[PDB]
Amino acid sequence: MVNPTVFFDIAVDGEPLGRVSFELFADKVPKTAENFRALSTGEKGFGYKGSCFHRIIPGFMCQGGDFTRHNGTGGKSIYGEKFEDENFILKHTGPGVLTMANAGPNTNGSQFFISTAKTEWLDGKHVVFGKVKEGMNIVEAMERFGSRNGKTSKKITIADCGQLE
């Protein structure tokens, strides 16, 4: 029962940037971790491969996971259109946290943030379920393509993704 590792290979206007890998805390948040894991492998028939990071705010976060509408209005979980907040055990302690985006209580879908700063105001409202394990430098390099209002100056995509172990 070791925690799963997934990877994203990132591209910038189609040109390879690098690989980010993520530990998912399936010991502490198993339902939320499993959703992200299975969206990363595509094993249910849908998932993250080919989808974009639509909102990047330097000094705050990168946001992705909307594989249906590419702009923050879509996505879905492996459990249905939304699922519940599992728990709030883990906190937003610094850069490199993986945490679920939502639109109110019990509205988790497929969208997520990768933090690039400590974001403690999110504690108890957004479920933390993983952390960057390798390639934080590649998250930093993404962040450069963001802007204050979140629009990206180039298209930042998940060119490939899957499970490493």
Residue numbers in the entry: 1 to 165
Cite, word for word, the article reporting this structure:
For human peptidyl-prolyl cis/trans isomerase CypA, a combination of biophysical experimental techniques has elucidated general principles of the energy landscape during catalysis. To directly observe the changes in an enzyme’s energy landscape upon directed evolution, we turned to a previously designed second-shell mutation, S99T, in CypA that had three effects: inverting the equilibrium between two states that are essential for catalysis, decreasing their interconversion rate, and causing a parallel reduction in catalysis. Here, we use directed evolution to identify mutations that rescue the catalytic activity of S99T CypA. We measure the effect of the mutations kinetically, using NMR, and structurally, using room-temperature X-ray crystallography and multiconformer modeling.
A second round of ~1500 variants in the background of S99T/C115S CypA identified an additional mutation (I97V) with a further increase in activity. Our data show that the S99T/C115S and S99T/C115S/I97V mutations increase kcat/KM relative to S99T by 3-fold and 5-fold, respectively. To reveal the structural basis of the increased dynamics in the group-I residues and hence increased catalysis along the evolutionary trajectory, we collected room-temperature X-ray data for S99T/C115S/I97V. Alternate conformations were identified using qFit27 and the final multiconformer model was obtained after subsequent manual adjustments and occupancy refinement. A swap of the major/minor states from WT to S99T/C115S/I97V is observed for the group-I residues, thereby directly delivering the atomic structures of the conformations for which we measured their interconversion rate by NMR. Both the C115S and I97V mutations subtly reduce the amino acid size, and combined partially restore the “Phe113-in” conformation as a minor conformation that can now be directly observed in the electron density. The interpretation of increased conformational heterogeneity of Phe113 and Thr99 was additionally confirmed by an alternative ensemble refinement method. Here, the increased dynamics can be rationalized by the ability of Phe113, which directly abuts the substrate, to transition between different rotameric states. This transition is controlled by the repacking of alternative conformations of core residues, such as Thr99, and is enabled by the decreased bulk of the mutated residues (Cys>Ser; Ile>Val).
